[PDB]
């Protein structure tokens, strides 16, 4: 599915992402907008052979097993296919692991380049 902004904010809140590890909800909405355009089926192939999956574009080099990323790890203990459903639970639970791993939300390329250092609370305005 492709979420609307406030619909996704509400779903992320129901999944406990709001203020997770101190990151307010707007951070997560901004990250999803710029990673995937709020699209649970988004995929992106990288020139290192890894792929980014799902609404938070979680990458197969470290976080999920797709069977095709040489020498990679699977720290979320899931197949990457689980990140390509319309239910965001697997993405949220893996994001919670990622964000607790030692670099916070800096693991997300789109967040660190396009969200961090902006007024991210604006992403939940009107919701
Ligand atoms: Cl604004
Ligand atoms: Na992997």
UniProtKB/Swiss-Prot annotation:
CDD domains per record: LYZ_C
Short name of any one Pfam family annotated for the protein: Lys
Binding of substrate, residues: 101
Annotated S-S bridges: 6-127, 30-115, 64-80, 76-94
C-type lysozyme domain mapped to chain residues: 1-127
Top-level taxon of origin: Eukaryota
Annotated GO biological process: cell wall macromolecule catabolic process; defense response to bacterium; defense response to Gram-negative bacterium; defense response to Gram-positive bacterium; killing of cells of another organism
Positions of the catalytic residues: 35, 52
The keyword Transcription regulation is annotated on this UniProt entry: no
Ranges in a coiled coil: none
Enzyme class of the recorded protein, top EC level: hydrolase
GO cellular component labels: cytoplasm; endoplasmic reticulum; extracellular space
Family: Belongs to the glycosyl hydrolase 22 family.
Subunit text: Monomer.
Name of the protein in its database record: Lysozyme C
Organism: Gallus gallus (Chicken)
Species lineage: Eukaryota, Metazoa, Chordata, Craniata, Vertebrata
């Amino acid at each position: 599915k492709v979420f609307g902004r406030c619909e996704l904010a509400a779903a992320m809140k129901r999944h406990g992402l709001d203020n997770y590890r101190g990151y307010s909800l707007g951070n997560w909405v901004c990250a999803a907008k710029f990673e995937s355009n709020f699209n649970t089926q988004a995929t992106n192939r990288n020139t290192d052979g890894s792929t980014d999956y799902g609404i938070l574009q979680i990458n197969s080099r470290w976080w999920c097993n797709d069977g095709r990323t040489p020498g990679s790890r699977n720290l979320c203990n899931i197949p990457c296919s689980a990140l390509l459903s319309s239910d965001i639970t697997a993405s949220v639970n893996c994001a919670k692991k990622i964000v607790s791993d030692g670099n916070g939300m800096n693991a997300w390329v789109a967040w660190r380049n396009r969200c961090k250092g902006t007024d991210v609370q604006a992403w939940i305005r009107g919701c």
